[PDB]
Design a protein around this ligand. Structure first.
Ligand SMILES: COC(=O)C1=C(C)NC(C)=C([N+](=O)[O-])[C@H]1c1ccccc1C(F)(F)F
Ligand SMILES: CC(=O)N[C@@H]1[C@@H](O)[C@H](O)[C@@H](CO)O[C@H]1O
Ligand SMILES: [Ca+2]
Ligand SMILES: [Ca+2]
Lengths: 169, 240, 675, 224
């Protein structure tokens, strides 16, 4: 009850509940780039590429980011099954395997972010408004709500010779 | 009297301080007053002590050993000029000898004399660490002469002043590496003195790592076996 | 009314509400653009400087309706705030916003005072180096006055000849030359008056640029002449005596003063009681301990796999495969062959499979509840999963990221779990940084105060290349200014940054300046800024180091000859092989056979035990509960009571007399060690 | 050499010249003399210049001749037994960062700006040669009439880079000393961009320098 029902571990776990959906806001919305030739204004994403002058023509062609963000979604899936099952049956240790996947799901958007930047750099201007700063707020959420959940679930430093790490109870 | 020696102590110090380049001619001449006036007043505070309370006791004090040489070497310089023997090399050396007159405020501190009481009885322990340290520097300075002397013959035009060509200069170069200051630039010259960044000639660099690591290991056994063991006995002698 | 103004401010929702604005008020200074007062960033942050400053005005009136040294600054932070919305100095003292946090945090209230106590103590010693600095500065004025001038070409020896134009020769080539004007130049650090000489000698005491001043002094010749190469090489004696005197001995006799007089902070109280510090570090361990977990499994199929893994040959196999992965990671280099680039692709899939098989077998043998409880297996679970992903993600690259390759490097860290002496040294210092966070908080604050003031005073210098203010080293953002400051703390040509920040520098064009006012950037406040920062930082860093060395001095003088916690640490493991979980007691059929495995400082010797180990265990004080039920928090007091503290009889409750007065608080369960 | 002769035959035979051998200080005295005649003969027969540098071992015979200097080197060597767990921590830390650097910065600092058509590196008068980049995160090579091509050996005449394990470990030891570490930081920024690599560098200068010196100093305090 001490590492799983403390409030400092549930403020963090509710914070991941924000970043689990903001990284889902990014992975469906294709709004993190603006092609601006000057009409041929196109808005890039992972899955659909849509050129807007209504003449809304959304289609596909980017593959790297898409493939990389199957794993960022997937770890999110595999971390919560560890996290949803670690609040019951008095196993908070189980809570520990789950966090690692939130750092990974954090860092598998940050490849995605870097992968999407190259596409806009090789292809007329660039501007991101709606879903780069979404995912750069779900990167920084999942990457840092994962490391802090880790240190809020690893026991601590004993601070005493008698105290031992992973000390009984 | 504990407030009227500091008139000539803080006039002399001030006199020493105002020395600067391209200074006025009245300022040089005002410093011709203060050297003559205060050396006579340095006699009056000294001749009163050797006759007014005993010349046997006057030598017994440690700073009253110091008081005589201020007068005996100050008026010696005034007799050196006023004989036609201004001696152009001895005009600026002896103006650093009257710079010991601002060492007369040692009698005014009375706060860290338990350290110097302590520091003094340990100078046969001070020099045994400082000899084997200076012995260490000599062996690495001569080793750099064999490795790097005669070898910095680059057909550049840049100057590489910390080199190993003489023994005095080689010596200057080793002490520079011991402080750590720009020690990599000395190592870059020694690698290019051999072939350059290539497998035999890059092993020059282990000279510089051993001199930095083992040398500063001795520095922390020198200045910390001093300043722990000589600065805890003062703490013992103050608590007694 | 004095009762709603008294209860709102007091308890908890006023302290976590105003301080979360002080932290956000301070972040508003840092986010400011220095070059333009007209930025759309710099406009919209001023509207938070009216949003915070109306809230802190509420804090004053809600406080000054209550009552009639540290609140007169809080009135200064409000009063400057409405004014600033000389105007140039009313922006600079807007940096005092983190100082009202060191009044509200009582952990901060004390650590600022301990500095000020250590300032007044070090003052007499400080006077002695200050007078020594003056004594040496005057010797240097008599040696080097008027002698640090030179010409642009080194051919011309007096200022009268140093006129017109000379040729430089690029790349040393006498065919390739350009025309430049010659100019009589003065060295930036000189011994010309006494006050410049103290500035020169302060630089040499930091060790920064001292060979540049040394070779300038060896070449000095006469007053108003240029240098002569290797003229007076014997002036190295001046510089080397000053370094040994000031930069070594004096600095040391300043540090070792702090060390012995921070011992007194743990020594100014007096302890003439029955038990000394080594009896204190021994009794309380037996009192305050706790049994732990040895996740021994059941089910002899699982025990068949368990006897493999915890054994020595599996610990020896897996730590000799981390060594070979470390060697294979070292073997990579640039421009390598095709059969060399890919055998770091074949083996790195091979090493990933081998460590993914040891992770599986430790789930199966350790009863997977019992795997994740051990902290060095959570670290190994993250290296496994992160290096599974990089093997896939590089495979998915060529089938149709440099971060995930780092996991490969990280496996090397595992080797430090076998090293008890390095892991105990690591824990002892890491905990002491953890235990004393406010001494390091001050350093963070010092940088922060300095960086905001540096952006305000230096942030408009242009980033020209070949100077010290450039794209890599400036004051034009907060991350950059902070980085520049750190460089200075490191002392990495900090005096040359100092010269690039004084008056007369080129302003960048995106600054607001009149035509004919380009070289008006920089200020001679840089001298106070840099020297002061340099001096504040040295005090701050030695303060932190000596406070950390204090915490672990029982360990730093632990004297492994006599006795230590390590004998005790070893004991719990032995006990843990009798317990599936903690539970208190073990059987008695293990209490005879316990004493064959322990070191003779704690257990008994190497010899035949049919005299000592058979009688003294009953012969010493042991608790008498029922037959096979004797507990861990009752023997382990008495089991070290053989190793030290031998007593006579009748006074066994006179053990418990000194277990309250020389002890700390209650320790309620101590009836176990008494009888 | 007659000193090494009259100090084996004042004692006796072999097991009496072992009484000349048992103390470690006379062991140092005999390697010097043998080595001394070993180069002075091979110099005459070759009528050696690299074996000349072993004569600097002769001033260590002077610590064998002063008794109050043999009590310091023993106490100097005695302080190294506390500071070995630190020295093995420093070592593995230079190994960790060298390898990481090798992976991250391997072969990255090989483009500088040149004069167009030429093999002449372009710098400003006080600038040292630094890496360039074309159309990326690095610095863009904007001096005047220059373009950047990658045929450059590197930042200090090809010494400081991360191309192999040996040169990566030399640039990491050089940073851990705090001397020139911001040159290496600024060169990596120039090569690949300034957003990430300060994390490499500040973490090394904080763990490998400051944290290490708190423990070394602590051990010294414990010993004294
Ligand atoms: C006044 O002395 C000074 O000018 C100092 C000089 C010239 N050099 C440096 C680097 C100091 N500093 O600010 O750290 C002081 C110094 C130096 C050695 C010991 C003590 C101090 C002391 F000033 F802290 F006392
Ligand atoms: C030799 C050389 O490159 N000269 C340059 C020229 O190319 C450039 O067009 C002009 C504009 O600044 O400046 C000058
Ligand atoms: Ca230095
Ligand atoms: Ca330096």
């Amino acid at each position: 009850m001490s590492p799983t029902e403390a409030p400092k571990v549930r403020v963090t776990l509710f914070c991941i509940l924000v970043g689990i959906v903001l990284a889902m806001t990014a992975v469906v919305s294709d709004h993190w780039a603006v092609l601006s030739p000057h009409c041929e204004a196109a808005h890039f994403g992972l899955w659909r590429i849509c050129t807007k002058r209504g003449e809304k023509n959304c289609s596909y062609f980017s593959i790297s980011a898409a493939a990389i963000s199957v794993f960022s979604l997937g770890f999110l899936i595999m971390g919560t099954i560890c996290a949803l099952m670690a609040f019951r049956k008095k196993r908070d240790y189980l809570l520990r395997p789950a966090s690692m996947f939130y750092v990974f799901a954090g860092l598998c958007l940050f490849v995605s972010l870097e992968v999407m930047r190259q596409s806009v750099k090789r292809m007329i201007e660039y501007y991101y408004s709606w879903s780069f700063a979404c995912a750069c707020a779900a990167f920084v959420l999942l990457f840092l709500g994962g490391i802090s959940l880790l240190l809020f679930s690893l026991p601590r430093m004993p601070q005493n010779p008698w105290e031992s790490c992973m000390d009984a109870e | 009297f504990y407030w009227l020696v500091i008139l000539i102590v803080a006039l002399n110090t001030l006199s020493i301080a105002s020395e600067h380049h391209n200074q006025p001619l009245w300022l040089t001449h005002l410093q011709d007053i203060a050297n003559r006036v205060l050396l006579s007043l340095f006699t009056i505070e000294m001749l009163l002590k050797m006759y007014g309370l005993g010349l046997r006791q006057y030598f017994m004090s440690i700073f009253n050993r110091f008081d005589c040489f201020v007068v005996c070497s100050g008026i010696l310089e005034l007799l050196l000029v006023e004989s036609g023997a201004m001696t152009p090399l001895g005009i600026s050396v002896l103006r650093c000898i009257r710079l010991l007159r601002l060492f007369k405020i040692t009698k005014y501190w009375t706060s860290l004399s338990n350290l110097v009481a302590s520091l003094l009885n340990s100078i046969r322990s001070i020099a045994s660490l400082l000899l084997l340290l200076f012995l260490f520097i000599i062996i690495f300075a001569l080793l750099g002469m064999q490795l790097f002397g005669g070898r910095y013959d680059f057909e550049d035009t840049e100057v590489r002043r910390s080199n190993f060509d003489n023994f005095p200069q080689a010596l200057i170069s080793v002490f520079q590496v011991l402080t750590g200051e720009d020690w990599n630039s000395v190592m870059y010259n020694g690698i290019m003195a051999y072939g350059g960044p290539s497998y035999p000639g890059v092993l020059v660099c282990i000279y510089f790592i051993i001199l930095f690591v083992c040398g500063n290991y001795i520095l922390l056994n020198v200045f910390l076996a001093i300043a722990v063991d000589n600065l805890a006995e003062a703490e013992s002698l103050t608590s007694a | 009314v004095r009762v709603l103004c008294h209860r709102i401010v007091n308890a908890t929702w006023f302290t976590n509400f105003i301080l979360l604005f002080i932290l956000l008020s301070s972040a508003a200074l840092a986010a400011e653009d220095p070059i333009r007062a007209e930025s759309v960033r710099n406009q919209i942050l001023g509207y938070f400087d009216i949003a915070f400053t109306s809230v802190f005005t509420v804090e004053i009136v809600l406080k000054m309706t209550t009552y009639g040294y540290f609140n007169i600054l809080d009135l200064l932070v409000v009063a400057v705030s409405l004014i600033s919305m000389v105007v140039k100095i009313l922006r600079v003292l807007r940096v005092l916003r983190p100082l009202r946090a060191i009044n509200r945090a009582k952990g901060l209230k004390h650590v600022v005072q301990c500095v000020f106590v250590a300032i007044r103590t070090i003052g007499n010693i400080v006077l002695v180096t200050t007078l020594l600095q003056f004594m040496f500065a005057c010797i240097g004025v008599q040696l080097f006055k008027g002698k640090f001038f030179s010409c642009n070409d080194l051919s011309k020896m007096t200022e009268e000849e140093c006129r017109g134009y000379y040729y430089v020769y690029k790349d040393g080539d006498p065919t390739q030359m350009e025309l430049r004007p010659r100019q009589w130049i003065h060295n930036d650090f000189h011994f010309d008056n006494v006050l410049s000489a103290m500035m020169s000698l302060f630089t040499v005491s930091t060790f920064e640029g001292w060979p540049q001043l040394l070779y300038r002094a060896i070449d000095s010749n006469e007053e108003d002449m240029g240098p002569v190469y290797n003229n007076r090489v014997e002036m190295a004696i001046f510089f080397i005596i000053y370094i040994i005197l000031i930069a070594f001995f004096m600095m040391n006799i300043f540090v070792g003063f702090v060390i012995v007089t921070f011992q007194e902070q743990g020594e100014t109280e007096y302890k003439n009681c029955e038990l000394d510090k080594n009896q204190r570090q021994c009794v309380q361990y037996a009192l305050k301990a706790r049994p732990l977990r040895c996740y021994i499994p059941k089910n002899p199929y699982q025990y068949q796999v368990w006897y493999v893994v915890t054994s020595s040959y599996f610990e020896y196999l897996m730590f000799a495969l981390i060594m070979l992965n470390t060697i294979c990671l070292g073997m990579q280099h640039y421009h390598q062959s095709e059969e060399m680039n890919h055998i770091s692709d074949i083996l790195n899939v091979a090493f990933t499979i081998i460590f993914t098989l040891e992770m599986i077998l430790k789930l199966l043998a350790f009863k997977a509840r019992g795997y994740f409880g051990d902290p060095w297996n959570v670290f190994d679970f993250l290296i496994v999963i992160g290096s599974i992903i990089d093997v896939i993600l590089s495979e998915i690259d060529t089938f149709l990221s440099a971060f995930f390759r780092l996991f490969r490097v990280m496996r090397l860290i595992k080797l430090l779990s076998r090293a008890e002496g390095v892991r105990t040294l690591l824990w002892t210092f890491i905990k002491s940084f953890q235990a004393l966070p406010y001494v390091a908080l001050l350093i963070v604050m010092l940088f922060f105060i300095y960086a905001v003031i540096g952006m305000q005073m230096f942030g408009k210098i242009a980033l020209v290349d070949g100077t010290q203010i450039n794209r890599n080293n400036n004051f034009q953002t907060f991350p950059q200014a902070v980085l520049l400051l750190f460089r200075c703390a490191t002392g990495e040509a900090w005096q040359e940054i100092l010269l690039a920040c004084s008056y007369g520098k080129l302003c960048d064009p995106e600054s607001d300046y009149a035509p004919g006012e380009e070289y008006t950037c920089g200020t001679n406040f840089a001298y106070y800024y840099f020297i002061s920062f340099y001096m504040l930082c040295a005090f701050l860093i030695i303060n932190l180091f000596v406070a950390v060395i204090m915490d672990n001095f029982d360990y730093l003088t632990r004297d492994w000859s006599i006795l230590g916690p390590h004998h005790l640490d070893e004991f719990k493991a032995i006990w843990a092989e009798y317990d599936p979980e903690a539970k208190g007691r073990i059987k008695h059929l293990d209490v005879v056979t316990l004493l064959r495995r322990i070191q003779p400082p704690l257990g008994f010797g190497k010899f035949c035990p049919h005299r000592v180990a058979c009688k003294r265990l009953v012969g010493m004080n042991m608790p008498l509960n029922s037959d096979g039920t004797v507990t861990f928090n009752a023997t382990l007091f008495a089991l070290v009571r053989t190793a030290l503290k031998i007593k006579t009889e009748g006074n066994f409750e006179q053990a418990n007399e000194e277990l309250r007065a020389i002890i700390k608080k209650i320790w309620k369960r101590t009836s176990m060690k008494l009888l | 050499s007659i000193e090494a002769a009259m100090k084996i035959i004042a004692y006796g035979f072999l097991f009496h010249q072992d009484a000349y051998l048992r103390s470690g200080w006379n062991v140092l005295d005999f390697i010097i003399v043998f080595l001394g005649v070993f180069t002075a003969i091979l110099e005459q027969v070759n009528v050696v210049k690299a074996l000349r540098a072993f004569r600097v071992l002769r001033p260590l015979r002077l610590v064998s001749g002063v008794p109050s200097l043999q009590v310091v080197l023993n106490s100097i060597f005695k302080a190294m037994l506390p500071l070995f767990h630190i020295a093995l921590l420093v070592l593995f830390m230079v190994i960790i960062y060298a390898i990481i650097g090798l992976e991250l910065f391997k072969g990255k600092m090989h483009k500088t700006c040149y004069y167009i058509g030429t093999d002449i590196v372009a710098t400003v008068e006080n600038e040292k040669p630094s890496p360039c980049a074309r159309t990326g995160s690095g610095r863009p090579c904007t001096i005047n009439g220059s373009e950047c091509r990658g045929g450059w050996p590197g930042p200090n005449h090809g010494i400081t880079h991360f191309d192999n394990f040996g040169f990566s470990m030399l640039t990491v030891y050089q940073c851990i000393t705090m001397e020139g570490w911001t040159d290496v930081l600024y060169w990596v920024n120039d090569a690949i961009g300034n957003e990430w690599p300060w994390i490499y560098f500040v973490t090394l200068i904080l763990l490998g320098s400051f944290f290490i010196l708190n423990l070394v100093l602590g051990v010294l305090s414990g010993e004294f």
